[PDB]
Amino acid sequence: ATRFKKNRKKRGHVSAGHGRVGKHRKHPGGRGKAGGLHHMRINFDKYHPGYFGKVGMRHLNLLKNRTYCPTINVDKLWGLLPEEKKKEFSENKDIAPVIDVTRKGYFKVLGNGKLKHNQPIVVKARYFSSVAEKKIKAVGGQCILVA
Amino acid sequence: PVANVYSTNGKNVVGEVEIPVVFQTPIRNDLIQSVYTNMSKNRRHPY
Amino acid sequence: SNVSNALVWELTRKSNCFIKKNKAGKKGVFLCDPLNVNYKNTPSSSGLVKSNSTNVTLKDGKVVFSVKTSKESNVVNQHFKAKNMKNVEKLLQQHGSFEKAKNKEKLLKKYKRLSKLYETS
Amino acid sequence: PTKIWRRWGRKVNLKEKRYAVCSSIAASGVTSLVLARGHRISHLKEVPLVVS
Amino acid sequence: GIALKNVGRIKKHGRKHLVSKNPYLRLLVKLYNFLARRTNANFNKIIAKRLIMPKRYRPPLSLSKLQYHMANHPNDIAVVVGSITDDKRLFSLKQLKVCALRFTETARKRIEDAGGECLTFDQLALKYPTGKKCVLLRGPTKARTAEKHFGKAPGKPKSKARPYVRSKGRKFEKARGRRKSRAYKK
Amino acid sequence: KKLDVIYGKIHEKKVTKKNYILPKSIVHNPDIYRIIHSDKVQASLLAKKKPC
Amino acid sequence: AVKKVGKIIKKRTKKFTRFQSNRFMRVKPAWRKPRGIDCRVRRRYKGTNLMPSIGYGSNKKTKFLLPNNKYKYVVKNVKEMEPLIMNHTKYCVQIAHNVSSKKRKQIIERAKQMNVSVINAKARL
RNA sequence: UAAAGCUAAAUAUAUGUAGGAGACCGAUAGCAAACAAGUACCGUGAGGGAAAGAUGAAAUAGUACUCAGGAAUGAGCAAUUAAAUAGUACCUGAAAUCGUUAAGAUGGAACGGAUUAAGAGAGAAAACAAGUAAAGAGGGGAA
RNA sequence: ACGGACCAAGGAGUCUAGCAAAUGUGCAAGUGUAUAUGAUUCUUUAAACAUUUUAUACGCAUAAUUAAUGU
Ligand SMILES: [Mg+2]
Ligand SMILES: [Mg+2]
Ligand SMILES: [Mg+2]
Ligand SMILES: [Mg+2]
Ligand SMILES: [Mg+2]
Ligand SMILES: [Mg+2]
Numbered sequence: 001a002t003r004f005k006k007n008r009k010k011r012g013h014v015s016a017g018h019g020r021v022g023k024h025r026k027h028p029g030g031r032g033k034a035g036g037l038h039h040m041r042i043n044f045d046k047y048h049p050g051y052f053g054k055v056g057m058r059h060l061n062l063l064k065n066r067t068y069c070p071t072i073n074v075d076k077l078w079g080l081l082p083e084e085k086k087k088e089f090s091e092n093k094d095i096a097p098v099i100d101v102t103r104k105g106y107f108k109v110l111g112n113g114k115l116k117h118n119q120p121i122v123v124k125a126r127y128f129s130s131v132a133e134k135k136i137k138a139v140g141g142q143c144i145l146v147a
Numbered sequence: 148p149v150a151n152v153y154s155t156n157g158k159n160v161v162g163e164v165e166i167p168v169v170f171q172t173p174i175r176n177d178l179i180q181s182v183y184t185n186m187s188k189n190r191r192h193p194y
Numbered sequence: 195s196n197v198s199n200a201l202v203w204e205l206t207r208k209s210n211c212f213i214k215k216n217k218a219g220k221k222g223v224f225l226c227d228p229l230n231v232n233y234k235n236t237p238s239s240s241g242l243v244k245s246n247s248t249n250v251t252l253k254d255g256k257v258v259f260s261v262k263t264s265k266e267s268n269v270v271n272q273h274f275k276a277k278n279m280k281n282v283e284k285l286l287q288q289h290g291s292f293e294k295a296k297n298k299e300k301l302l303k304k305y306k307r308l309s310k311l312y313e314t315s
Numbered sequence: 316p317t318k319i320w321r322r323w324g325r326k327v328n329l330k331e332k333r334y335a336v337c338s339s340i341a342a343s344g345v346t347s348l349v350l351a352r353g354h355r356i357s358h359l360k361e362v363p364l365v366v367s
Numbered sequence: 368g369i370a371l372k373n374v375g376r377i378k379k380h381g382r383k384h385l386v387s388k389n390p391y392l393r394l395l396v397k398l399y400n401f402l403a404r405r406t407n408a409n410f411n412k413i414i415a416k417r418l419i420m421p422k423r424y425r426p427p428l429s430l431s432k433l434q435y436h437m438a439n440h441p442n443d444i445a446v447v448v449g450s451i452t453d454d455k456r457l458f459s460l461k462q463l464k465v466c467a468l469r470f471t472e473t474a475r476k477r478i479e480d481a482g483g484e485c486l487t488f489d490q491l492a493l494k495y496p497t498g499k500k501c502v503l504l505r506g507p508t509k510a511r512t513a514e515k516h517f518g519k520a521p522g523k524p525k526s527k528a529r530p531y532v533r534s535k536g537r538k539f540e541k542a543r544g545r546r547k548s549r550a551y552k553k
Numbered sequence: 554k555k556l557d558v559i560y561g562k563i564h565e566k567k568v569t570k571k572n573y574i575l576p577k578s579i580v581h582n583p584d585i586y587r588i589i590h591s592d593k594v595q596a597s598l599l600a601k602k603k604p605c
Numbered sequence: 606a607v608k609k610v611g612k613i614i615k616k617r618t619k620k621f622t623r624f625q626s627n628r629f630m631r632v633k634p635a636w637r638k639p640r641g642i643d644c645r646v647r648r649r650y651k652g653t654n655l656m657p658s659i660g661y662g663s664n665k666k667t668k669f670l671l672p673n674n675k676y677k678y679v680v681k682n683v684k685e686m687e688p689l690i691m692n693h694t695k696y697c698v699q700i701a702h703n704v705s706s707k708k709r710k711q712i713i714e715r716a717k718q719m720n721v722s723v724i725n726a727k728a729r730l
Numbered sequence: 731u732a733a734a735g736c737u738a739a740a741u742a743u744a745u746g747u748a749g750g751a752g753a754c755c756g757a758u759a760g761c762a763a764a765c766a767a768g769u770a771c772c773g774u775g776a777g778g779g780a781a782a783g784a785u786g787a788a789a790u791a792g793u794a795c796u797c798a799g800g801a802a803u804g805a806g807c808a809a810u811u812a813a814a815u816a817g818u819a820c821c822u823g824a825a826a827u828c829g830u831u832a833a834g835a836u837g838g839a840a841c842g843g844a845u846u847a848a849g850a851g852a853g854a855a856a857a858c859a860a861g862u863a864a865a866g867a868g869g870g871g872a873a
Numbered sequence: 874a875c876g877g878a879c880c881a882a883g884g885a886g887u888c889u890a891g892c893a894a895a896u897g898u899g900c901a902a903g904u905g906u907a908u909a910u911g912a913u914u915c916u917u918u919a920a921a922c923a924u925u926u927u928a929u930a931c932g933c934a935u936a937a938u939u940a941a942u943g944u
């Protein structure tokens with residue numbers, strides 16, 4: 001809203017806040033990203049260090065749907081269950097839950113965190129990591145591969 | 148807490164109903180005014 | 195439980211259909227609401243904020259007596275037709291048990307002032 | 316020169332809209348607030364005012 | 368004349384008043400200013416100050432860290448001037464008593480199912496006027512992402528600051544100035 | 554009466570607003586001067602002091 | 606100079622007129638602050654126009670009182686002057702410029718019955 | 731399953747024509763043009779291109795008569811209108827610039843800041859008198 | 874040293890895209906009902922209201938690192 005703009009405070013002043021000696025002129029240093037590597041070098045180097053040059057191989061026709069893969073850690077793995085359902089399994093001891101994470105939108109199980117001690121759980125997925133699968137085995141569970 | 152139901156002649160009380168729980172919302176004039184300023188822009192015509 | 199006297203004061207400090215301020219002669223601001231004995235814009239004199247109140251007003255030609263005295267949201271607006279000093283004194287005992295003496299002489303003086311106003315036809 | 320691609324309207328979150336409507340119904344049930352908006356209701360009995 | 372610095376006038380630096388126009392918050396500020404003044408307890412002063420700070424200095428606190436902080440303070444009350452959030456990484460919750468400004472629906476439900484209670488600040492002002500057996504806590508104030516861009520500029524030796532980039536990949540700012548293979552690293 | 558169904562006090566298909574929760578307050582009771590005058594608070598105050 | 610009547614003190618009575626407004630007629634007398642190098646008024650040369658400052662301010666206890674020693678209130682109809690029945694010794698009334706004679710007669714007659722003074726009760730007679 | 735062919739809908743519309751509308755402009759603004767406007771006028775030619783709205787309710791009230799004067803025009807005891815200092819160049823009618831009368835100043839500029847004095851013009855809302863008593867003229871309230 | 878014989882009207886940091894910091898508001902491991910469709914919406918309304926009768930549209934966030942197979 002034009003009511004609150006800064007320029008209205010300079011309305012009786014001569015130079016509109018831009019200076020007697022250095023004016024407000026039009027493009028006194030170039031246009032856009034003009035002078036990089038010549039007279040804008042310091043800015044480019046201290047704020048965007050790796051900007052110039054190229055590195056790596058080409059990939060000519062990508063097709064990103066071939067490698068799409070969302071992940072989930074073992075922490076959030078008991079939290080997919082309702083709390084009253086989580087209560088029942090921790091009470092009884094000869095039953096365990098079987099969870100299929102692909103039905104929830106995850107493809108690869110990943111292994112950060114701590115599973116509950118002596119509480120078996122069976123997990124279905126497309127890919128597993130080594131540490132995640134070890135942690136699932138240690139508490140008495142099992143991993144299953146699906147496609 | 149209840150409310151009375153008045154007949155269309157304006158004098159008799161012909162029942163009562165229990166006050167709905169929507170009537171306990173916090174009254175917030177700042178929020179109402181701010182939401183109103185944005186919403187009232189949607190019916191303007193261009194020039 | 196979503197409202198109190200203090201919250202009602204917070205909502206009606208500035209935006210209100212009874213407030214009047216004078217652009218010229220910068221001193222002063224008034225509340226002209228029906229149950230304001232004075233006309234101060236303070237939480238301790240405004241009829242909308244207080245839970246019990248009494249007042250005397252003209253409102254049409256004659257003089258009218260008003261009571262609020264609503265203590266469980268039973269907002270009751272009793273209006274009585276003041277006639278003379280003795281009747282007003284009787285009504286103050288009848289309905290104004292919650293007032294101090296200090297407020298009662300102020301209301302009586304206000305009534306004595308209001309009784310001197312008249313017009314034609 | 317004024318143009319037709321000035322942003323004429325705004326988008327408002329749904330939850331805030333609903334919150335404001337709810338807070339505006341609640342204010343309709345306080346006698347003091349209704350009076351201060353300019354309505355002459357010195358002769359009403361109840362401010363919620365339900366009718367058959 | 369006379370040789371003073373800042374013409375003898377004392378300087379202060381923080382926030383002085385509320386910016387928010389919420390009437391309930393203004394009622395709270397009035398109440399706790401009164402309590403701090405008439406019972407100078409160093410508990411009411413800090414509270415009266417904290418509920419004026421801007422949003423970035425009232426961070427959320429999760430349930431797991433709340434329980435961890437109160438592990439050696441049974442039958443005490445925790446006081447927070449932010450919001451409490453749920454944590455799906457916890458398996459079980461104890462019985463706790465907590466006062467704060469806001470609770471999320473899931474956290475509020477989980478707290479009450481274990482036998483605890485939630486309080487607002489006008490209830491703690493009424494039952495604990497001087498904060499006896501109350502423990503003040505706050506969440507992380509330097510975990511926001513904006514803070515990862517502050518500090519030494521990215522380009523000085525051994526700086527941890529993130530850069531502002533269009534996107535992320537091998538083609539976006541990784542060649543000259545980021546590896547010894549192109550004229551120098553960092 | 555429809556106003557209790559609209560906001561989920563009683564549930565009904567195609568009338569109740571889906572998964573909407575009625576908002577909550579940061580103050581339990583906005584009467585601060587009733588809190589100040591209570592005995593518990595009044596017994597913790599300090600004697601009134603003098604101006605200059 | 607300083608003018609003092611009772612307890613009311615005015616620190617200055619002359620106005621502040623705009624620099625060079627006596628020499629050019631396109632320059633109006635209303636005060637504007639001089640900006641611009643080499644002015645001789647911005648630089649406080651002796652012998653020229655003075656600038657207004659916060660020092661000339663009035664005592665807070667007597668800031669808006671008229672020589673009547675009361676405050677002024679402007680009314681537009683009979684009903685607007687209701688609040689003056691409680692504070693009739695600290696206020697005086699003035700009638701608005703665009704009210705008719707018929708309305709003015711009523712306003713004056715009520716103001717007399719309330720024991721409040723009217724500043725301009727001689728207009729349109 | 732190439733080197734032959736056909737096909738509606740969902741899409742676009744600074745043109746032409748008709749209809750509706752706006753937190754738009756208000757006669758130096760808005761289209762160049764609110765009016766005999768792509769007109770008057772300029773250029774050998776391709777082309778360039780303005781200025782210019784308002785008496786009053788009604789003129790089915792637009793100024794009859796007399797005197798002076800060659801006329802134009804002026805004046806009236808004469809005349810329309812609520813109004814002519816609304817008379818057709820007609821609502822209101824600012825500033826620059828000029829006329830008339832009055833009051834002042836005036837030895838190679840004039841205005842000005844501070845402070846007083848001498849003149850001239852206006853002014854009673856603080857810049858005196860509640861109340862009592864006898865009439866006279868009004869206007870309200872209650873039992 | 875340059876502009877200024879006088880008066881009236883006009884006359885100059887704005888709009889859109891994209892990013893960030895600050896602050897206010899809502900919800901919170903989530904958040905934002907896209908294009909559409911529905912309705913006993915239809916002067917206003919080109920607004921407002923709704924969401925498909927153990928619930929996989931899409932964006933940003935919830936995980937990094939490497940030229941890369943990948944982990
Ligand atoms: Mg400056
Ligand atoms: Mg310049
Ligand atoms: Mg230079
Ligand atoms: Mg000094
Ligand atoms: Mg002055
Ligand atoms: Mg200089």
Ligand SMILES: [Mg+2]
């Ligand atoms: Mg073919």
Ligand SMILES: [Mg+2]
């Ligand atoms: Mg074809």
Ligand SMILES: [Mg+2]
């Ligand atoms: Mg039109």
Ligand SMILES: [Mg+2]
């Ligand atoms: Mg034009």
Ligand SMILES: [Mg+2]
Binds near residue numbers: 812
């Ligand atoms: Mg007339």
Ligand SMILES: [Mg+2]
Binds near residue numbers: 821
């Ligand atoms: Mg006219």
Ligand SMILES: [Mg+2]
């Ligand atoms: Mg000479």
Ligand SMILES: [Mg+2]
Binds near residue numbers: 875
């Ligand atoms: Mg030059």
Ligand SMILES: [Mg+2]
């Ligand atoms: Mg020149």
Ligand SMILES: [Mg+2]
Binds near residue numbers: 882
């Ligand atoms: Mg102008």
Ligand SMILES: [Mg+2]
């Ligand atoms: Mg922000």
